[PDB]
Amino acid sequence: ARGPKKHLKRVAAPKHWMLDKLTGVFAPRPSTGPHKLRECLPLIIFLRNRLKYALTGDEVKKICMQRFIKIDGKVRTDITYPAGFMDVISIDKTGENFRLIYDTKGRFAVHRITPEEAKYKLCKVRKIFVGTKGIPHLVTHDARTIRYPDPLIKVNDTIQIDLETGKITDFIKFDTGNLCMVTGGANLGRIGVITNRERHPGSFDVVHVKDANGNSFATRLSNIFVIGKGNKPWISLPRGKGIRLTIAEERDKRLAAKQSSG
Amino acid sequence: PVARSWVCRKTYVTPRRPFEKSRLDQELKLIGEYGLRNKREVWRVKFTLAKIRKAARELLTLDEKDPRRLFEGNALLRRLVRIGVLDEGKMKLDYILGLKIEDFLERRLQTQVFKLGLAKSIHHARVLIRQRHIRVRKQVVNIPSFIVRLDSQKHIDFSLRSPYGGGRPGRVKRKNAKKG
Amino acid sequence: DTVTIRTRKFMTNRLLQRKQMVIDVLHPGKATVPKTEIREKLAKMYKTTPDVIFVFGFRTHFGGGKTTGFGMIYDSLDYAKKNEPKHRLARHGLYEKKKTSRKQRKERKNRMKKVRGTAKANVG
RNA sequence: UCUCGGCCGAAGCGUUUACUUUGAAAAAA
RNA sequence: UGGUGACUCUAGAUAACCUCGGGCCGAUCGCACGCCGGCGGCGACGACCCAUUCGAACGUCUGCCCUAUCAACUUUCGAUGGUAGUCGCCGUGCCUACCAUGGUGACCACGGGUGACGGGGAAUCAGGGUUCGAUUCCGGAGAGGGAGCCUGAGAAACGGCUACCACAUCCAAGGAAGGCAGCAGGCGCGCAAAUUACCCACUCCCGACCCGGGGAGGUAGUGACGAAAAAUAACAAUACAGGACUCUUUCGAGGCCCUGUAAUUGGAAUGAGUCCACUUUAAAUCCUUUAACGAGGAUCCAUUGGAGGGCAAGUCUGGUGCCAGCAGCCGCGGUAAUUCCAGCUCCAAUAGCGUAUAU
RNA sequence: UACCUGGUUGAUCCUGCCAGUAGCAUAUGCUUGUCUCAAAGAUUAAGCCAUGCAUGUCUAAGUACGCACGGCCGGUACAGUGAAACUGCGAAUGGCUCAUUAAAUCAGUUAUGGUUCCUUUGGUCGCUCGUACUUGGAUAACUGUGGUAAUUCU
To answer: Which residue numbers delimit the S4 RNA-binding domain (chain B)?
Structure first.
């Protein structure tokens, strides 16, 4: 191929989009943006497939071009705009806010948040560097550069960002015992307390996490996102609290619900 | 590139030996008792039972306290119980291999229509089903191979529009009465 | 009487100035209910006017029991003309498509490609 | 753990592979 | 200052340079308007530079078919390495100059062949395996065959250009224009494969764009590639034989006992079909739904193979007479042929079945 | 379902292959009522192509002096739609095909601390000590004259 590619085949689309096969040949090729192609939800998928506010891409385009959608406090009219982890979607016309938080199955669950929590987000800093007359700069997962960060912030820490101003209001250090959530791999969507971090120089450091119920798992360092200090998350969590249920437990819960169903 | 799907699966297998007296006699006996159109229906039910048995053997080769064995075996047993093929108490993977094609041919809509006092004969049952005289719960079922579930057994009425259940005279009766 | 309407799913959808729903119509012994009849029954049911009611995609289940489709109730006819597909408006008579086929348009465009300036306006 | 060790206060290869078991990472169809 | 496992990293300070082929530091556009000349809110567009996204390009480790009637290969015209440079977006024999003589090989190098694009995968399969993968997803490559370029962020682009080769089109003979391995369609090749249809309504993509375009795609047409479901009848009373808890001398009867040439007799049931109205959908169609008509030889008429064995089903009848033919194999046919040609009968699958070939 | 059967002999037991047997994929013959899904010029010729279409694009926000229309009425800087043209962007995506191609492509793995990166997103953008109440020249479109048998030539 010459130059970039602009299409995304439907089967080649990320599985967590929960797209079906017979609707079309193509999937919404996410626009370039703060989040990677495979770790993002396009605005069209969220507005049509998840919220059912629209039936086609035409109605999604109408909704977006009426300027009703604000991702991280700013209006976006791109139907394929990539909204990613921790992004805050605000629809003031319907007066509702969502935070893109991974389901325990690895999918962006529709998670409604209160308007007060909609004013801030959490960002994991990706890199820190001194530049241009000694000003410290910090780059997070949302690809936003913040100058003059707190000197106590390091890589893999997670800052709290005020969406209106874009400034850091607090931060959490990457330390053992802090709450964390997995943003990639097999354990994607799981929430637990960091227990230890085995370092492999020249390679990927492995972080061990322990579930609230006591199920221990492991992940790479790049797939860990610190969520709160201790066992107190700084954000609201989905209906599942990050606990992965084994298929036996899922079946048992579903059968118990059917026993008391109406 | 097309939005179409191509996953299509053949539902039967032809026997290895085409002309053996024992197999031919048994297949024709099954067709006779259950009023099936041809041999492919027997082969289809045999393929269904064979796939079920293969799954049961696979699961039985695993450890008793194996999460995959437990989950898949419970799913298979519940499925076989729900269609009434297995007894409610015979819920072990060993009782799967003890099943026969009779247990599956007994659950067809043809057999259930014939055995619920809805049809005079099993061929009458097939002719009734294929002519939209039979309904299950609320849906007018028309396919005689419909494998009715256990909770679906108690609701097999005679439709609400069929001459036998809905009271509207059919074409023949209407034409005959209109000249009398 | 013999034809009933019940809207299973229902959302207020303030974003497109409409309420959308799935219509289940019960017509136990009749043909598929015409869209106009479903529209007027919906208008009576939701205390509005029939001109802002847009129904589509009515599939009748096997055996003749019920038909299932989709319906929209716009807040006004202006919002209806603003947020509806052109063909759904053309069903109500509120839109008129072009009177030329794709072949004519494509051939005219490719003929225009061969001329320059205002002469492009003088092609067939 | 060896610079001894955060309610009595940490060894978790401080001589190697195969093998075996585990974990991570690994498109969809 | 900060960071990495690790820098000749980032940042800071010096002493200078700064390509007319500057390299940045806005002479741009819309909307709404408010204070004492000025001050301003919300945007759009643009511009270095750093991140980010989308990638691209290059390297690492491990893994591809058959061939020795291919055993030595590379090293003149870079072959392996080192030094310096050139070029390049950068690492690099990528290319030079100088130096060293290296590098690969039975653990199969090198050469040849491939009806070889690779993979995810497909068929078959007890456990192993064998074979296939042009083909809708990923990666690669190409646009008749080579080569060279322009623009741009990205192309060695071909629905861009330049040239040569092979074809080919128009010409007033001076010149000019080409590239369907895009969608249709045509010729040719062959055993072998569909419409010169409708639409951007869906899925997405592109653009200055809520508005335009898209043979990408969708929808129809041809379609026994293949796969799923599935009609071609069901019931009853009768002439008949058949069958049974009973006694009987063979009947009676068994009809919530059951078979059949029954082209008997009946009423029921119904969809194949033709027409309606919807429904479907950009218009259509097709299903689905509602009507009207529509079955007794229910003529609304099921076929393809076979009947010696293997292997299911006739050494019945007529004809032929080692002929014509059947026969995958064994064999049949030479004047009573179970085997050919036909009639009848049967049986295997059944809207499917036979044959050829590959596996 | 982890299977065999016929054929060398006067007869037997073997080795052994031939033939049978069941899928599968192409072709082909006969036949064909319903309905759903669905492949389809790959194999030989990456052979040759008539014709038509397949890539274009404007918002309130680059340039409006085409009366082509046209207003609240006028001696009105530009009312407003607005073809054309200049400008910007895209045309390097998609689609097709499998001829090349044998550690080459490709797959898993890892690296770029050895590079480039339109676009999106965030940051930076009076950090420079030396007509601005806005500079200049064109060129389209438009008018007008032409050449050529001939073209999206000019």
So the answer is: 107-180
Task: Please count the residues of chain B.
Answer: 180
Retrieve residue A189's tokens.
Answer: 């969507």
Query: Which ranges in chain A are annotated with CATH 3.10.290.10?
Result: 1-116
B1: the nucleotide nearest its CA (via C1') is E136
Give me the resolution in angstroms, 1 decimal: 2.8
Whether A140 sits with its Cβ under 7 A from any strand D atom: the answer reads no
* Residue B155 DSSP one-character state: -
Determine the nucleotide nearest to A137 by Cα–C1' distance: F123
Residue of B nearest to A21 (CA): B3
Determine the Cα–Cα distance for residues C8 and C20; give it in Å rounded to an integer.
Answer: 10
In which element (H, E) is residue A2 found? none
Architecture of domain A174-244: Roll (2.30)
Q: What angle do CA C68, C73, C78 make, to 5 degrees?
A: 140
Experimental method: cryo-EM
Of B27, B32, B25, residue with least CA distance to B46 = B27
Which architecture, in CATH terms, is A1-116?
Roll (3.10)
Q: Which residues of A touch B66 (CB under 8 A)?
A: none
**C83 part of contact set with chain A, CB < 8 Å:** yes
Measured from the CB, is B80 under 7 Å from any atom of strand E?
no
